[PDB]
C-alpha cells in the first residue's frame, strides 16, 4: 500500500501533487485485475488541474509514501520491481501508447529488490526526461509487489501481483526531439496471466531467476536511479 506524494525536478521539490498534478486514486490499495481499465492510471484516471514543467535531460524524481510523507513508504513485505512508462497526454493512456523509460527488478550485486531500495531512498526514484516532442505527457510509475504473486489474481482474487500505479502530468517544454516517442503498449493489455514476472513465487523461486514483465526499456530512454534526491525533512 503506497501512493505518490509529488515529484522533484533537478532536486527541487514541486510540492504536494495529490489531486493537483498526480491523478491520485482515493486510497493506497493496489490494482490486481490485469484486464481492468484501472491498470491505465489506477482507479480515478481523469485530468487534474496542473502539469509539472520540465525540459529534456532534467532529473524527474517520483516520491512515494504509505500514510504520511517520508514515512515507512511501503510495507517491507512488498518486494518487487519498479518501472516508469511515458505516453502522450492526449491519449488519456488509451491504446498502444505506453513506452518504458525505466526498469529495476532484483539487483544481484546488492541482493535487493527495487522496492527494498525505494524504502532506503525515502520513497524516491528518478528518470531522465527523454528527448521526445515538446508537449503534455503522462508518466506512469508502477511498483509491482510480488509477496502474493505465486497465485494469479484470475485464479484467486484474494492474491496476485499487486500494481501500485500513479500517473503524473508532466509538460516537456524544451526538447530537441532527438528521440521521437514511438507507439508503445496498452494498459490494460500488456500484462496477461502468461506474461513473465506476473506469476512469481518469492518464497520458492530465487529472485536471481526473476524476469520483469516486458516490454523492454525503450532505446531512447536515458536512465534513472532509486536514490534520495531531495530531503523532505529540511522543509
Ligand atoms: O496479511 C496480509 C498481508 O497484509 C499486508 O499488510 C497490509 C494489510 O493487509 C492492509 O489491510 C493494509 O491496508 C491499510 C493501509 O496500509 C493503510 O495505509 C490504510 O490507511 O488502511 C489500510 C486498511 O487498513 O496495508 C498493509 C500494508 O501496509 C502485509 O504487509 C503482508 O505482509 C501480509 O501478507
Ligand atoms: O535497472 C536494472 C534492470 O534492468 C533491466 O534491463 C533494462 C535496463 O534497465 C535498461 O537500461 C536498458 O535500456 O534495457 C534493459 C532491457 O529492458 C532488467 O530487465 C532488470 O532485471 C534489472 O533489474
Ligand atoms: Cl498489501
Ligand atoms: Cl497511485
Ligand atoms: Cu500493500
From Swiss-Prot:
Residues engaged in binding O2: 147, 162
Domain of life from the UniProt record: Eukaryota
Note describing how the cofactor binds: Binds 1 copper ion per subunit.
Major site of localization recorded for this protein: secreted
Annotated Cu(2+) binding sites: 1, 78, 164
Organism, scientific name: Panus similis
Disulfide bonds listed in the record: 41-167
Biotechnology: Lignocellulose is the most abundant polymeric composite on Earth and is a recalcitrant but promising renewable substrate for industrial biotechnology applications. Together with cellobiose dehydrogenases (CDHs) an enzymatic system capable of oxidative cellulose cleavage is formed, which increases the efficiency of cellulases and put LPMOs at focus of biofuel research.
Catalytic activity: [(1->4)-beta-D-glucosyl]n+m + reduced acceptor + O2 = 4-dehydro-beta-D-glucosyl-[(1->4)-beta-D-glucosyl]n-1 + [(1->4)-beta-D-glucosyl]m + acceptor + H2O
Keywords: Carbohydrate metabolism, Cellulose degradation, Copper, Disulfide bond, Glycoprotein, Metal-binding, Methylation, Monooxygenase, Oxidoreductase, Polysaccharide degradation, Secreted, Signal
Post-translational changes noted in the entry: The catalytically essential N-terminal histidine His-1 is post-translationally modified by methylation to prevent protonation of the histidine side chain, and protect the critical active site of the enzyme from oxidative damage.
InterPro entries: AA9, AA9_LPMO
Keyword Metal-binding part of the UniProt annotation: yes
Similarity section: Belongs to the polysaccharide monooxygenase AA9 family.
Alphabetized GO MF terms: metal ion binding; monooxygenase activity
Methylhistidine PTM positions: 1
Glycan-modified residues: 33, 110
Cell location: Secreted
Protein name: AA9 family lytic polysaccharide monooxygenase A
Regulation of this protein's activity per its record: The polyphenol cinnamtannin B1 contained in methanolic extract of Cinnamomum cassia (cinnamon) acts as an inhibitor of catalytic activity.
PANTHER family named in the record: ENDO-BETA-1,4-GLUCANASE D, PUTATIVE (AFU_ORTHOLOGUE AFUA_1G12560)-RELATED
Amino acid at each position: 500500500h503506497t501512493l505518490v506524494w509529488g515529484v522533484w525536478v533537478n532536486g527541487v521539490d514541486q510540492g504536494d501533487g495529490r489531486n493537483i498534478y498526480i491523478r491520485s486514486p482515493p486510497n493506497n490499495n493496489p490494482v490486481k485485475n490485469l484486464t481492468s481499465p484501472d491498470m491505465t492510471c489506477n482507479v480515478d484516471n481523469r485530468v487534474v488541474p496542473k502539469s509539472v514543467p520540465v525540459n529534456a535531460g532534467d532529473t524527474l524524481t517520483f516520491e512515494w509514501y504509505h500514510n504520511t510523507r517520508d514515512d515507512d513508504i511501503i510495507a517491507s513485505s512488498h518486494h518487487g520491481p519498479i518501472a516508469v512508462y511515458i505516453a502522450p497526454a492526449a491519449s488519456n493512456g488509451q491504446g498502444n501508447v505506453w513506452v518504458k523509460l525505466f526498469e529495476d527488478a532484483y539487483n544481484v550485486t546488492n541482493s535487493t529488490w527495487a522496492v527494498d531500495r525505494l524504502i532506503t531512498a525515502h520513497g524516491q526514484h528518478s528518470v531522465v526526461v527523454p528527448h521526445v516532442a515538446p508537449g503534455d505527457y503522462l508518466f506512469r510509475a508502477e511498483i509491482i509487489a510480488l509477496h502474493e504473486a505465486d497465485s494469479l489474481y484470475s485464479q484467486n482474487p484474494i492474491r496476485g501481483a499487486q500494481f501500485y500505479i500513479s500517473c503524473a502530468q508532466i509538460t516537456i517544454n524544451s526538447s530537441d526531439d532527438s528521440t521521437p516517442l514511438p507507439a508503445g503498449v496498452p494498459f490494460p493489455g500488456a500484462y496477461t496471466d502468461s506474461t513473465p514476472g506476473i506469476q512469481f513465487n518469492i518464497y520458492t523461486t530465487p529472485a536471481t531467476s526473476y524476469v520483469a514483465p516486458p516490454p523492454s526499456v525503450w532505446s531512447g530512454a536515458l536512465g534513472g536511479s532509486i536514490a534520495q534526491v531531495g530531503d523532505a525533512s529540511l522543509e
